[PDB]
Write a protein that binds this ligand. Structure first.
Ligand SMILES: Nc1nc2c(ncn2[C@@H]2O[C@H](COP(=O)(O)OP(=O)(O)O)[C@@H](O)[C@H]2O)c(=O)[nH]1
Ligand SMILES: [Mg+2]
Length: 660
């Protein structure tokens, strides 16, 4: 309730370059829809349509929380600062909106400000974005006298008594603006004829289209990604935001309007999931929020069926039932408990202990589908962290072995030499965000480090070696003696320990101890100090002493054998051969072609999209540290990229020997 209808849903995101007015716009929209922050989806009502506003924290738009977020939204409002029109970053959200295929309208904000110019937005949408903007509105007045808005679709005008959002009036268009309005109204009809036959047979014949035909035609052209209708105003001075809301219901898609999502069955079939509220239940968890009134709050989008309060669902990623205790929607100022969330909709569930973000939720006796591929992409960027004193070290762990319940993609450790904390993400950007999600969100006044990569080490030759630790030490003898064979495993397989000891040759008691010694020595390779992988260790012989043998003793002997196996094993360096997706204006095609090659790369194939290009690439993350402000140095602040893991390769000859 209000009575759910799919055609009246409107799932949107507000996207924008930093400082353009994303938050102000959101906030005024929550003010205007509430007459009658935190939350990952806030819901509201306008005319008779539910608007679900999806939050997308992203001071930069490059990461991996925006391949999930863009599967969960249907439409978007792109907000330009009007003094600039498009900036770098406007350019780059346009690219993602284009790549994932999401209908959008533009809001030229800050029309009250000094510099503001409708036309620079539009001209700069045409040139640099290839957008096909259509002028839906003209401004009455300039900067400090900006005072009214003309709807060129309907040939009506609005004036604003004040800056409080509290006195709006429908006027006939001032005489001194009429010819400009008629100019841009006829441009609108011309655009409308390219998506509707009947409008074309009216234009030729000298006839005004009904406003409903026009709305329907611009709607159709918007949703099939052909035009971007542009509105303006000032969210700060409260003009135009109620007409922006009217444009959300007129032009932005319901869940009926975009192609259904695709999921995978365990039997491998890629399948379309239709937005049918009475089909089986399929849903995505897209964000987990430690919430301070009900606790763990998992936000979901329903794609199919109906999720019900106090029913069970089955998490196909994990392998387990979970009770949905409660269902909530978040409004601007309040929470609302609801009995159900149906196809097309978003909300939060309470209950749910082991569902983390990206997990698919299904019926219980519903077809087990997966919506996001099974994979935790490897942790490939380590980092040093000084918190400072004992009111920091003790309370940094407070929100790391607690804060990972929200993002469990990352890991934490402690270098084999330096007794400290090391943090591990999956790309330069991924980690830029995490240290200062914490000094702020946990009042940890603490010391910044700089980031390193995560190579590995392994052998390429079966060896046979030994490890003795024999020492008078601590006013007693220590004796431990192991013999191991160590063998390459195929890349990826990980670790294997085989115990082939014959009859007390090493006492059992101590065979765990040797194992402990091997994994601890495995943390540090000989070439370059990094962890060893993809080996089969086989303990086949050794000896002991009747009083002097100990666990400590056999632990070090195991460390020493494995240390020595790796050095004697024709060792070798594994680097992460990882995958970019460099978007770039066609003009700088060759410039980032040859820059990505002077950081080691075999280019996989570049395909064209929009008024630009998409150079997918192989590049070891090591020679890409700080690619953000090097790509946007060689592409005039119009490039983007998106980065991730793919596999581990043996570095060729010279590469080995640069690292030492
Ligand atoms: N001049 C003026 N300032 C605005 C307008 N809209 C937003 N701002 C201001 O711009 C600054 C950044 O706005 P904010 O919504 O936080 O930007 P965001 O980074 O895109 O969330 C704040 O001072 C806002 O008050 C506008 O309509 N006119
Ligand atoms: Mg903001």
């Amino acid at each position: 309730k209000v009575e759910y209808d799919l055609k009246r849903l409107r799932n949107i995101v507000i996207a924008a370059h930093i400082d353009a007015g994303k938050t102000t716009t959101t906030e005024r929209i929550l003010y205007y829809t509430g007459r009658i922050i935190t939350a990952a989806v806030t819901t509201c009502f306008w005319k008779d349509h539910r608007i679900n506003i999806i939050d997308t924290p992203g001071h930069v738009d490059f990461t991996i929380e925006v391949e999930r977020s863009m599967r969960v939204l249907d439409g978007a409002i792109v907000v330009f600062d009007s003094s600039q029109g498009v900036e770098p970053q406007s350019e780059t959200v346009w690219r993602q909106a284009e790549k994932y295929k999401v209908p959008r309208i533009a809001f030229a904000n800050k029309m009250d400000k000094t510099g503001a110019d409708l036309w620079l937005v539009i001209r700069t949408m045409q040139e640099r974005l290839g957008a096909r903007p259509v002028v839906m509105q003209l401004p009455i007045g300039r900067e400090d006298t900006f005072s009214g808005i003309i709807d060129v679709l309907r040939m009506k005008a609005y004036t604003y008594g004040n800056d409080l959002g509290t006195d709006i009036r429908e006027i006939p268009i001032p005489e001194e603006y009429l010819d400009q309005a008629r100019e841009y109204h006829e441009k609108l009809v011309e655009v409308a004829a390219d998506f509707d036959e009947n409008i074309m047979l009216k234009y030729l014949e000298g006839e005004e289209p009904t406003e409903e035909e026009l709305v329907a035609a611009i709607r159709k052209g918007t949703i099939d990604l052909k035009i971007t209708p542009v509105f303006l105003g000032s969210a700060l001075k409260n003009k135009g935001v109620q007409l922006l809301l009217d444009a959300v219901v007129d032009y932005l898609p319901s869940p009926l309007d975009i192609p259904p999502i695709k999921g995978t069955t365990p039997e491998g079939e890629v399948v379309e999931i239709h937005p049918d509220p009475n089909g089986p239940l399929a849903a995505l968890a897209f964000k987990i929020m430690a919430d301070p009134y009900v606790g763990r709050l998992t936000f979901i989008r329903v794609y199919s069926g109906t999720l019900t309060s106090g029913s069970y669902v089955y998490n196909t990623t994990k392998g387990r039932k979970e009770r949905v205790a409660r269902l909530l929607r978040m409004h601007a100022n309040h929470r609302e408990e609801v009995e159900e969330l149906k196809a097309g909709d978003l909300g939060a569930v309470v209950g749910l202990k082991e569902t983390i973000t990206g997990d698919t939720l299904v019926g219980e006796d519903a077809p087990r589908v997966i919506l996001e591929s099974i994979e935790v992409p490897e942790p490939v960027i380590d980092v040093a962290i000084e918190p400072k004193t004992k009111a920091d070290q003790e309370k940094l762990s407070q929100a790391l072995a607690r804060l990972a319940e929200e993002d469990p993609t990352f890991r934490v450790s402690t270098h084999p030499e330096t007794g400290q904390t090391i943090i591990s993400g999956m790309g330069e950007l991924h980690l830029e965000i995490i240290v200062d999600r914490l000094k702020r969100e946990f009042k940890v006044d603490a010391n910044v480090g700089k980031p390193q990569v995560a190579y590995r080490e392994t052998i390429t030759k079966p060896v046979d070696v030994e490890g003795k630790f024999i020492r008078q030490t601590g006013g007693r003898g220590q004796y431990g003696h192991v013999k191991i064979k160590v063998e390459p495993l195929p890349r990826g397989s990980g670790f294997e320990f085989v115990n082939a000891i014959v009859g007390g040759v090493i006492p059992k008691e101590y065979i765990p101890a040797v194992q402990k010694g091997i994994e601890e020595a495995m943390q540090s390779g000989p070439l370059i100090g990094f962890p060893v992988v993809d080996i089969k260790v086989t303990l086949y012989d050794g000896s002991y002493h009747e009083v002097d043998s100990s666990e400590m003793a056999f632990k070090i002997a195991g460390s020493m054998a494995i240390k020595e196996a790796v050095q004697k094993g024709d060792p070798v360096i594994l680097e992460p051969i990882m995958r970019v997706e460099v978007t770039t204006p066609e003009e700088y095609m060759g410039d980032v072609i040859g820059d990505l090659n002077a950081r080691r790369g075999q280019i996989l194939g570049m395909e064209p999209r929009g008024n630009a290009q998409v150079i997918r690439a192989f590049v070891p993350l090591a020679e890409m540290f700080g690619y953000a402000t090097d790509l946007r140095s060689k592409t005039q602040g119009r490039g983007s990229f998106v980065m991730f893991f793919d596999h581990y390769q043996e570095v060729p000859k010279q590469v080995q020997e640069k690292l030492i």
